[PDB]
Amino acid sequence: MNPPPPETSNPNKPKRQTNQLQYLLRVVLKTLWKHQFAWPFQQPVDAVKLNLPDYYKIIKTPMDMGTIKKRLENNYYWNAQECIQDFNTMFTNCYIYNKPGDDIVLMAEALEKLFLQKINELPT
Numbered sequence: 001m002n003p004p005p006p007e008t009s010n011p012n013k014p015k016r017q018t019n020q021l022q023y024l025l026r027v028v029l030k031t032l033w034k035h036q037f038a039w040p041f042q043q044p045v046d047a048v049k050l051n052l053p054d055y056y057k058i059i060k061t062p063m064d065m066g067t068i069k070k071r072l073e074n075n076y077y078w079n080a081q082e083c084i085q086d087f088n089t090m091f092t093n094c095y096i097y098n099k100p101g102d103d104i105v106l107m108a109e110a111l112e113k114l115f116l117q118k119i120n121e122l123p124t
């Protein structure tokens, strides 16, 4: 049931290491990574382990912080907005598949609040 994980290395993509991208890796992701509620988002959803054969039949653009981290470390992104879009996909996937008030949603919401606080001001 588990599809292959999203791509994290692509030598053909045009890469950059902007100040903003470095900050997203060194400050934003690494602080989120240590949050008490980070653990469900640190790797792709393992639908086999969770016995959720429906998950990837609903969520067609999966994303997780482990993937974002590998992408940042591989300079996969051209700008910070591309990386922020991946974070937003991760959060939105959770809000789509689950319902308001579910425990996993409360965890995603806590992470998102921290994420939005940290990216409110980015380097120049």
Ligand SMILES: CC(C)N1c2cc(Nc3nccc(-c4ccccc4)n3)ccc2N(C)C(=O)[C@H]1C
Pocket: 039, 040, 041, 045, 046, 050, 052, 055, 093, 094, 097, 098, 103, 104
């Ligand atoms: C809804 C839940 C299945 N959920 C999820 C689960 C995990 N991992 C995990 N492992 C053991 C127990 C639990 C668990 C069990 C009952 C209540 C709350 C958590 N969750 C990792 C990520 C996700 N995300 C991001 C989702 O959107 C969906 C797929």
